Structure formats: structure tokens, C-alpha cells
Design a protein around this ligand. Structure first.
Ligand SMILES: Nc1ncnc2c1ncn2[C@@H]1O[C@H](CSCC[C@H](N)C(=O)O)[C@@H](O)[C@H]1O
Lengths: 246, 8
């Protein structure tokens, strides 16, 4: 038996010996994060993580990954959010994100907390995941902007939200993408991501090299000509940005 | 439209 790797567009992959039907099912299947090193290894059924133990990919021989399990008993499973449940383990952090970002006071004035890089990385690096409950565009668009600070469009049917009180890390730290502040001159973008625990979500990906302890920012991308459909702080911010443009 | 990153 040889091994198969199946990559997602975001660079993560499932890897293992497939079964009679070409399915990722068995006790020695892994999800490998985009760093091609951090992995969740163990029991999968048709590509869904049943019990993934944190591991490090130490080498690949004839295409077969050779892992070492990390100490501890960090286990993860597929746990997609619903309309009302953000996570079965809200305080269990993502182990890839934990090595790449931390939350601190923003450097942007009056912006509360922000998301910062722990280490220097290159362009095109996935830094953080934006998981949340999954609600409709109808609910979100029909309600006040004060409730919509953490809403992220996922696709034409779903918006991801991190509603109070899960916007505080003492209550929810499984993912941290909702902590990145806005910039009209950002160093990251939101990008599609298929996560073995969260399912189909978005991630924060660098668009250039970033230094250790640099604040990560993304363009929130509100509609500027539906004036702008956006919160006050952003509209005020948009004026200024437009000012600098000539 | 009251969410980030839509494809207008
Ligand atoms: N460029 C900017 N200027 C001012 N406030 C900002 C900003 N980008 C984000 N924010 C703030 O962050 C919210 C989105 S969530 C971003 C994390 C938030 N700062 C926190 O502490 O949890 C917005 O409602 C706004 O209050």
C-alpha cells in the first residue's frame, strides 16, 4: 500500500493509506496544517476527524509521513459550529494558531484588543482562523450595527459571527481571527479555509512578510456605495483614507 | 451587507 495526500486549496492536507474505496478512513490518517509540519493524527472516517492527536511531521519517506506525537493529551475532533453553538470546547485553543498569534491591546487608537504575530513570517502565511456561529444574511442585515462588530460573510448563504460573550478570550479562545482589526492598508487578507475541527471557515493569511510582534490587520471590506454601509468608526476612517489618496 | 468581506 502507498499513501495518498489530498490537498485543499489553502495548503492544508489529509494524508494516509486510503481504504478499498479511496476514502481517508483508518487509525493512522492525519490532517497536516499549511506549515507542512503541525498535524492532527489518528482516527478519521471518510476524511472527517474522529480523534486527532497533536503531532509533528518529522520526515516523509517514499511519500509516507513519519510523525512524532506531542506530549500531553491534546485531542481534537470535527466540531462544526451551528446557529447557536460556537464550539464544544470553547477554551481549547487551536495548536497551529497558538504558535503564530496572540491577543493584546491594539496599536490603533481606541480599537480595543488586536491580533499580533508571535514570530516573523513570509507572505502567503496562514496565521489565524475565523470560526464562529453560522447565521443568515437576513438576521444580520436586519439588525443594528452594534450587534455586527464580529460578523464575517462566509458565502452567499452564511455569515460567521462571534457574538457576546464569546468576543472575550476568557470565554472563547478556540480561534482568534475575530480579534484582527481593520486597516485600509492591511498586511493580511481573509481567505477560504477548510479546517479539520471547524469545517469550512475563513482564515487570516499574510499578503507580505510580517515581523515578530507586528499587529495583524485586514480590510473589513464593507460596501462603500450600496454613503457606506458600515459602522461609524469605519466611515470616519474611510474619510481619512480617501484624504491621503491625493 | 452588515458583515465583513462580502462579494458585492
Ligand atoms: N481600524 C479600526 N479603528 C477603530 N476600531 C476598530 C478598527 N478595527 C476594528 N475596530 C474595533 O473592533 C471591532 C471588530 S472586532 C476586532 C477586535 C476588537 N478590537 C476587540 O477588542 O475584540 C469593531 O467593532 C471596532 O470596535
Amino acid at each position: 500500500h502507498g499513501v495518498c495526500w489530498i490537498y485543499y486549496p489553502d495548503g492544508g492536507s489529509l494524508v494516509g493509506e486510503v481504504n478499498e474505496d479511496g476514502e481517508m478512513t483508518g487509525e493512522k490518517i492525519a490532517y497536516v496544517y499549511p506549515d507542512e509540519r503541525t498535524a492532527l493524527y489518528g482516527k478519521f472516517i471518510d476524511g472527517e476527524m474522529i480523534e486527532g492527536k497533536l503531532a509533528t511531521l518529522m520526515s516523509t519517506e517514499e511519500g509516507r509521513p513519519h510523525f512524532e506525537l506531542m506530549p500531553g493529551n491534546s485531542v481534537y475532533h470535527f466540531d462544526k459550529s451551528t446557529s447557536s453553538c460556537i464550539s464544544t470546547n470553547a477554551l481549547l485553543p487551536d495548536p497551529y494558531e497558538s504558535e503564530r498569534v496572540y491577543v493584546a491591546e491594539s496599536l490603533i487608537s481606541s480599537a480595543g484588543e488586536g491580533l499580533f504575530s508571535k514570530v516573523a513570517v513570509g507572505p502567503n502565511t496562514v496565521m489565524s482562523f475565523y470560526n464562529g456561529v453560522r447565521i443568515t444574511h437576513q438576521e444580520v442585515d436586519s439588525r443594528d450595527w452594534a450587534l455586527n462588530g464580529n460578523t464575517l460573510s462566509l458565502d452567499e448563504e452564511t455569515v460567521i459571527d462571534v457574538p457576546e460573550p464569546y468576543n472575550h478570550v476568557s470565554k472563547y479562545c478556540a480561534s482568534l481571527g475575530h480579534k484582527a482589526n481593520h486597516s485600509f492598508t492591511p498586511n493580511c487578507i481573509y481567505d477560504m479555509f477548510v479546517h479539520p475541527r471547524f469545517g469550512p471557515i475563513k482564515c487570516i493569511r499574510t499578503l507580505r512578510a510580517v515581523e515578530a510582534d507586528e499587529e495583524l490587520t485586514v480590510a473589513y471590506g464593507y460596501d462603500h456605495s450600496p454613503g457606506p454601509e458600515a459602522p461609524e468608526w469605519y466611515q470616519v476612517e474611510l474619510k481619512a483614507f480617501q484624504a491621503t489618496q491625493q | 451587507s452588515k458583515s465583513k468581506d462580502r462579494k458585492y
